[PDB]
Design a protein around this ligand. Sequence first.
Ligand SMILES: CN(C)CC(=O)Nc1ccc2[nH]c(=O)c3ccccc3c2c1
Length: 323
Amino acid sequence: MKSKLPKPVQDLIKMIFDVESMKKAMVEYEIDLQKMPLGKLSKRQIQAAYSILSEVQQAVSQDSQILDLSNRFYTLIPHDPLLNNADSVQAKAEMLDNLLDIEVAYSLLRDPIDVNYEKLKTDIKVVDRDSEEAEIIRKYVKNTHANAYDLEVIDIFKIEREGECQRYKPFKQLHNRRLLWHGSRTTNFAGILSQGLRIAPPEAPVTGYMFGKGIYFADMVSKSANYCHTSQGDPIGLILLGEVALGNMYELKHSKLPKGKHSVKGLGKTTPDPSANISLDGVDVPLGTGISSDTSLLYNEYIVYDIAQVNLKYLLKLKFNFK
Ligand SMILES: CN(C)CC(=O)Nc1ccc2[nH]c(=O)c3ccccc3c2c1
């Protein structure tokens, strides 16, 4: 029966639950879809591939011994590439980080649009273009952009994740609560809305993460926009905006969080203008233009090591221009 959901929401549900986009990504990840289809994909083997990927990372102590386990990974994950380098492990690490959010997407998936919206267990409300919050969101995109592509906001959604507010409740008393970006691939978003924003498992190798396993954020929209993996063919992507209770920040230029700190701030070369900082709802919004800050980073990085420190507030349907 005719759904009463708005068109930008209706079209977003079609986008985040696109079966063809999932199979398309599996082809691009070189995965042999004939020996392992989309359906026969299981979490039990993804987690097993990780514990074998971390064993290749263990081959730091000691070439014939490495390839005996390197090919054993290709036994679990069919491919249609020798894993000995640290770069080779990180590449397959990002693949499994993406594959798991597709296994979650197709698990939920297996009128129809209204069932899928409720399957995600989230309230997605469209934000009007004339609203005050739309100007503040559009200014944050236009001013915190670094120039190889141009960004234009197609839609703004106020996303209310089920059971996230009561989870975020104790961290709301923390100081320095900022509104930061989290960019991810269009396919992962079905899992990001149901399970939420998560941290990498202990099975996964630590080599791939600069500041260890946690939830990574940025103040510059362009930084997170690169993690959308958008091309000339399909330029539409999805980026998030979440309330991150940072509090006591551990400022790093280059173990686990000191007794007293609550977050890590990887200092960068360029920071959004602090004299142009708006404190909307008692939450800092660094929508100023990029000014200069020894630092081994592009721009600033904000990492939290507790899933509850995050409260996903907005969602943006972005269009990418290629010059
Ligand atoms: C630490 N890594 C690059 C491995 C990885 O796949 N994680 C990952 C995965 C998704 C990420 N998304 C982001 O928006 C982001 C922003 C600033 C810094 C990092 C990220 C980010 C990082």
